[PDB]
Motif scaffolding. Structure first.
Motif, PDB file in Angstrom:
ATOM      1  N   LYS A  35       0.809  -1.209   0.000  1.00 54.50           N
ATOM      2  CA  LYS A  35       0.000   0.000   0.000  1.00 54.50           C
ATOM      3  C   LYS A  35       0.861   1.286   0.000  1.00 54.50           C
ATOM      4  N   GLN A  36       1.924   1.312   0.771  1.00 57.23           N
ATOM      5  CA  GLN A  36       2.790   2.480   0.815  1.00 57.23           C
ATOM      6  C   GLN A  36       3.372   2.679  -0.587  1.00 57.23           C
ATOM      7  N   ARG A  38       2.261   1.685  -3.532  1.00 60.29           N
ATOM      8  CA  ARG A  38       1.225   2.108  -4.401  1.00 60.29           C
ATOM      9  C   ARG A  38       0.940   3.590  -4.218  1.00 60.29           C
ATOM     10  N   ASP A  39       0.805   4.077  -2.977  1.00 56.15           N
ATOM     11  CA  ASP A  39       0.490   5.501  -2.700  1.00 56.15           C
ATOM     12  C   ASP A  39       1.633   6.425  -3.212  1.00 56.15           C
ATOM     13  OD1 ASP A  39      -1.946   4.848  -1.548  1.00 56.15           O
ATOM     14  OD2 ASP A  39      -1.226   5.034   0.572  1.00 56.15           O
TER      15      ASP A  39
END
Length: 53
Positions: A35-36, A38-39
């Motif tokens: 997730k990190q 991707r962000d």
């Protein structure tokens, strides 16, 4: 040996519990990182677009 047998069952229980904990927490940690990433990649794309002007 009732005692050796009970020891072994206890150590089997611990082993399952500990391996389960490791597996879940590992998966969740990896999840978090992805997730990190991707962000960060989304923000980079947006910044780069913006800078094109």
């Amino acid at each position: 040996d009732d005692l050796f047998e009970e020891l072994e069952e206890q150590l089997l229980i611990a082993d399952v519990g500990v391996e389960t904990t490791r597996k879940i927490i590992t998966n969740l940690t990896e999840g978090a990182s992805r997730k990190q990433l991707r962000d960060a990649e989304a923000l980079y794309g947006l910044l780069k677009e913006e800078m094109g002007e």
